[PDB]
């Protein structure tokens, strides 16, 4: 179980127990998306995406079981399909549960010419930078991937530390969801 | 979905943060227990239960599912066993869903006599006064009873509001255990 965030404010701290509350009574897919509406104008974004996936043995995405789209543009998520994306996106490649995940930290390390291809056409289209959470249930190899695109979340340290402990608690939600 | 308490301390928020927080991450019948005997012991009580149960088109319990004995007294539940409880305990005809009940009041508004003969024998074995809190999910019209036996945490308002806020967590928690 990740640790709750120190520093939070008592507004910050009141927001993330609402946030978590709230997340324990989502039961259906429009009461998960509402639900990321209002958790995204909390956040110096507009694009957002949850999916849950079934995971190999290293916790990694094998196959998308659902996608949420909340806001990321529609043409963006229609190229990624069409072109194959997911075989070449490293954030599909993370090991879920081992923390949140920086797309820049991770673009830059990124060696395979597929790879590079792919980050040159996700930066054209704004998605060069944001952060992915992440959480794993084992109880049958099964995980979501929480994606916020943009600079500007990164770099509120309470924000990541709210949604990174959201996370598993949208991931019960997806389970239930699904 | 119940509006969280208002009037809590910085520590009291904290706790019930700390509360929903790891709700979410149970996934076992052990895990279940031991988070339970860590909320019983910020509580003014020895005895415990939790208790998931299938229900009729009015939220009251028509089968029980699952009783996780976290510290009602063990003759006592062999008792309530053997002679038939289940039939005449005015707490199991709650309402699940509809607001947390005390017993003490409940117990004052019967009047059969099977019922009366119950409350004679309850409170002889130190269960006269409590409160139980409840939630109800009609996804597969199945609820959760959480008993605490006792008159001091029915009057300390803040506990009663962060025990009753915990519960519909507590609820989600039971239906992943079992
Ligand atoms: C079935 C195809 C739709 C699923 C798309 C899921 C994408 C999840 C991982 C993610 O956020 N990647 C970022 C990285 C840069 O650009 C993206 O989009
Ligand atoms: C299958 C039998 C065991 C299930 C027992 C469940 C009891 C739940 C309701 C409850 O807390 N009633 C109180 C009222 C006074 O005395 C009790 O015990």
Redesign the interface.
Known sequence: ?RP?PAGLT?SQ??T???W??????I?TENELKAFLDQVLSQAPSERLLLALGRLNNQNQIQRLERVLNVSYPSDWLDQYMKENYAQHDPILRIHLGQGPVMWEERFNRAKGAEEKRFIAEATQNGMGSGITFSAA?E?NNIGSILSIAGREPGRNAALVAMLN?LT??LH?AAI?VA
């Not at 978590?20 to 009574?25: K, S």
């Open positions: 179980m709750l008592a701290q009141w993330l127990l609402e978590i509350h709230m997340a324990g009574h039961e249930s109880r402990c598993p608690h019960q239930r």
